[PDB]
């Protein structure tokens, strides 16, 4: 009796919930919706009180969720911009802009987290500081009269010295007082530590949630695919977003070309050729590429080393590491592509090799930059012993790197896209060779390189946000400027590519690279927190021998010593190492198990 009524109510509710995902006309959908609604209305009296309350609160929650979604849609920006870019250039060009907008949202969330709990309480405490205060923090929040005059030198400002050094943007500006004041008792050093931890935790959580949403629904059925060449190139051969005439003609030509070499390659199936000249060229290219990578390492190390001055001896030569890093990052991919063109591989394998080389260059440069910066900081601290502020200095280095990267990206957009396009338009009639159809054709969008730029910049932000609390706040403006300049450049100066390939034809490729970068960037921060010791005249951790002490000092205030000593044996090397080895072995064997299961899932279908 009651069981059948409950089952019928559940079935009707399930039908109502999944109503939109069915291919019915609006009249049929309305008919089914009204029928189920009347059924539920007449059957609501059959269930007990608990079921009635459960259904009522579920309906209230659904109504609140719908209202929240309706209000949230009003605040999504850059809808028409991405719509126009999609219509003109395609759906693989607009992937970069959707990725950038998601990155903007993540950065805004990080900014709010670091602004509600750290910057705002400190500023409010500073504004109400009495005579008793303002003297314990004068050495860190007030610029000395010795250097106050030289605060505006166009080299002090460009290096974030002067007033910016004594601004909430940097670690050393924040007081180490255990409490903000009476009647409030806000622990600011604990807020600092917890906010730095929470930002990394939320970054991991958001990246993994996006990955799960994109994999469990979008590409869940996309896995375990075998062959299916012609059907893939035909049924998914037309981009439905394109609403431009020239782009449509280009797409038609691309489909024709794809099918033509598809049948051409499937026809002969004969692959016999061996030219010593081609192999020699390939090995020469692979050698010169490694030579350029080594040159990049040596240049980065030299640039870091030569900036050995801390006092204002000279500033036209101190600012060379951000310039060198930006120049390498923004120029070497072009040479990589030139060498790949000389190599003469298949376009897909050439693109994959270029992406792999760019990724290797980026990772190697980032690693050597971290090692050089850490060695420089260690040497400076050793030579120091008026104590220096290595955290504020590291924050300044990262902020300068980010700013110079923005400047170089703007210059690259202005030169490669705008000026080259103008030169081709107004000078191809009488040039020595036909540039309009030659190697510098007209300019094209590079989705993968630009996404790697975004990922590298976000890694730089994650690395240095512990020392520069307002680095995500600056990154917000940088990302907004980047979105606008990229949109304008692609709309005005670029032409749609004849055919553009994808690295793995997945949306989680870049998310996975971003997650790997997040791990790579959280390792040195954890090492700094666990190993290095704070400065005694800087920041909120100036009263402790380690960065984590402010946490443990409060853990020991509630936990006994005996149980703490018992727990402290879980961090033994002889317990961690077998656990790490077990995780490695289980991952290695589960890898083969999962690959076999995925391969056999399609076979059993």
């Amino acid at each position: 009796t009651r069981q059948a009524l409950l089952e019928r109510i559940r079935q009707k509710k399930e039908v109502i919930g999944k109503l939109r995902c069915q291919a019915w006309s609006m009249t049929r959908k309305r008919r089914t919706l009204k029928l189920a609604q009347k059924y539920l209305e007449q059957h609501e009296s059959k269930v007990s009180r608990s079921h009635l309350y459960m259904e009522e609160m579920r309906k209230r929650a659904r109504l609140m969720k719908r209202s929240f979604s309706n209000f949230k849609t009003y605040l999504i920006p850059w809808e028409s911009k991405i719509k126009r870019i999609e219509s003109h250039f395609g759906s693989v060009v607009s992937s970069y802009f959707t990725f950038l907008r998601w990155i903007v949202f993540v950065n805004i969330m990080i900014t709010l987290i670091a602004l509600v709990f750290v910057v705002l309480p400190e500023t409010l405490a500073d504004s109400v500081a009495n005579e008793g205060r303002f003297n314990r923090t004068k050495t860190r929040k007030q610029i000395p009269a010795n250097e106050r005059v030289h605060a505006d030198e166009l080299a002090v400002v460009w290096h974030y010295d002067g007033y910016l050094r004594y601004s909430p943007l940097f670690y050393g500006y924040y007081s180490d007082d255990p409490f903000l004041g009476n009647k409030i008792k806000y622990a600011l050093p604990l807020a600092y530590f917890m906010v730095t931890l929470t930002i990394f935790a939320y970054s991991f959580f958001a990246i993994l949630r996006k990955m799960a949403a994109n994999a469990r629904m979008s590409k869940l059925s996309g896995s375990k695919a075998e062959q299916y060449i012609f059907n893939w190139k035909l049924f998914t051969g037309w981009d439905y977003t394109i609403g431009n005439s020239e782009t449509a003609s280009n797409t038609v030509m691309a489909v024709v070309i794809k099918l033509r070499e598809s049948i051409a390659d499937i026809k002969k199936d004969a692959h016999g050729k061996f030219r010593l000249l081609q192999f020699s060229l390939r090995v020469f290219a692979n050698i010169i590429i490694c030579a350029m990578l080594g040159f990049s390492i040596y240049c980065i190390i030299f640039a870091v080393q030569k900036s050995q001055v801390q006092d204002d001896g000279n500033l036209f030569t101190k600012n060379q590491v951000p310039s060198v890093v930006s120049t390498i990052t923004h120029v070497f991919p072009m040479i990589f592509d030139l060498i790949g063109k000389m190599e003469n591989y298949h376009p897909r394998t050439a693109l994959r090799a270029h992406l792999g080389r760019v990724l290797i260059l980026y990772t190697v440069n980032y690693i050597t930059l971290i090692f050089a910066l850490f060695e420089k900081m260690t040497a400076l601290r050793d030579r120091v012993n008026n104590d220096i502020c290595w955290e504020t200095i590291i924050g300044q280095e990262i902020v300068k790197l980010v700013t110079m990267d923005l400047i170089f990206t703007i210059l690259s957009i202005l030169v490669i896209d705008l000026f080259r396009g103008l030169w081709i338009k107004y000078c191809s009639s009488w040039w020595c060779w036909d540039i309009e159809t030659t190697f510098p054709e007209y300019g094209e969008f590079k989705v993968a390189e630009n996404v790697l730029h975004i990922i590298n910049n976000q890694g730089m932000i994650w690395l240095g946000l512990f020392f520069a609390p307002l680095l995500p706040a600056i990154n917000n403006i940088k990302l907004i400027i980047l979105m606008y300049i990229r949109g304008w450049a692609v709309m005005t100066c670029n032409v749609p590519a004849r055919e553009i390939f994808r690295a793995s034809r997945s949306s989680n490729f870049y998310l996975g690279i971003l997650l790997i970068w997040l791990l790579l960037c959280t390792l040195p921060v954890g090492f700094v927190i666990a190993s290095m010791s704070p400065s005694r005249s800087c920041g909120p951790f100036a009263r402790y021998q380690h960065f984590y002490t402010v946490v443990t000092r409060e853990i020991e205030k509630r936990v006994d010593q005996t149980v703490l000593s018992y727990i402290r044996h879980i961090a033994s090397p002889g317990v961690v190492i077998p656990i790490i080895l077990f995780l490695i072995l289980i991952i290695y064997f589960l890898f083969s198990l999962v690959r076999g299961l995925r391969e056999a899932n399609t076979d059993l279908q």
Partner: protein, 184 residues
Amino acid sequence: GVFTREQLDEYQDCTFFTRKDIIRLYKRFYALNPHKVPTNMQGNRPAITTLTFEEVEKMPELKENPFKRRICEVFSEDGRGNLSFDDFLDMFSVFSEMAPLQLKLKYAFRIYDYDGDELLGHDDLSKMIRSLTRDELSDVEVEFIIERIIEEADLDGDSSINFAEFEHVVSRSPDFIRTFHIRI
């Protein structure tokens, strides 16, 4: 506001849209032809307010689509050669990015079939290839392409793909949900 709420709740329950999307699509529908679309649109008027196929195909999102006629025909109401506001909402809720893979696959199969017999015959394949390519491939090339597609996509030996095999073969494509998308 201007419209009754109950219509908006029904549309949200049936489609993927919110109130802002409904209002924007209504404004676009009115701007398509202000003469045949009244300002106040309360009641059963959405079922009777109708536009021809030429006006809907005139829009930029559908103008360059080779299958614009098929897209207009699949979502068409009982009246032949006509589209109403409900048909507009169906078309732009199926095509949106938030739509699930199953709905996209099913309506893509319905679009790619011209006769409408739930079977992807040889004539449908040839017509759609010649529509997508614009008669640039040779006849022998088209025959070879259809032969290979039939060989690698037909399992029952019927020489005609159906819903099941089409869904099995093109739902593992990593470019289908990226391509089969219309933003509006």
